[PDB]
Amino acid sequence: EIDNEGVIEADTDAPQEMGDENAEITEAMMDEANEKKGAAIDALNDGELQKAIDLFTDAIKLNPRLAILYAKRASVFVKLQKPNAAIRDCDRAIEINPDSAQPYKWRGKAHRLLGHWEEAARDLALACKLDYDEDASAMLREVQPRAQKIAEHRRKYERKR
């Protein structure tokens, strides 16, 4: 008996626009993506989450090798209850800088939204050791016994199987 509270329906959209991972990023471009970054936060404080996503995407296309632009867009994406698109962003952030804690914080929420108990118990616990937050901790403590219970069930099964 597993408590599926807070668990929603997986987003079934086309991949959001990523960058050109292998593109030349110039001084101008680098400036031009920074101003967009600032504006996309201005929208995020103010609550216009979709204007944030467009302004993060507009930055990502000019500076596709900046891990924060992917950590922060997936910050928004979780709010719009879009975990796969979050995960998509997060996976791109780590692949750049795995030393950054945010990509594991959000990707762990994304997994929590989808009901991936274990997947979530890792990433959160990992972000808690990379850069502790009370928001990550509280989430982890919530997921823990779920992810435990599921993993304990997974054994007893795969053992017979």
From Swiss-Prot:
Subcellular location, in the record's words? Cytoplasm
The record's family statement is: Belongs to the FAM10 family.
- Tell me what organism the protein belongs to: Rattus norvegicus (Rat)
What part of the entire protein does this chain span? 81 to 241 of 368
The entry's function note states: One HIP oligomer binds the ATPase domains of at least two HSC70 molecules dependent on activation of the HSC70 ATPase by HSP40. Stabilizes the ADP state of HSC70 that has a high affinity for substrate protein. Through its own chaperone activity, it may contribute to the interaction of HSC70 with various target proteins.
User: How does this protein assemble?
Assistant: Homotetramer. Interacts with HSC70 as well as DNAJ homologs and HSP90. Interacts (via the C-terminus 302- 318 AA) with GRK5.
Q: What is this protein called?
A: Hsc70-interacting protein
- TPR repeat start and end residues: 33-66, 67-100, 101-134
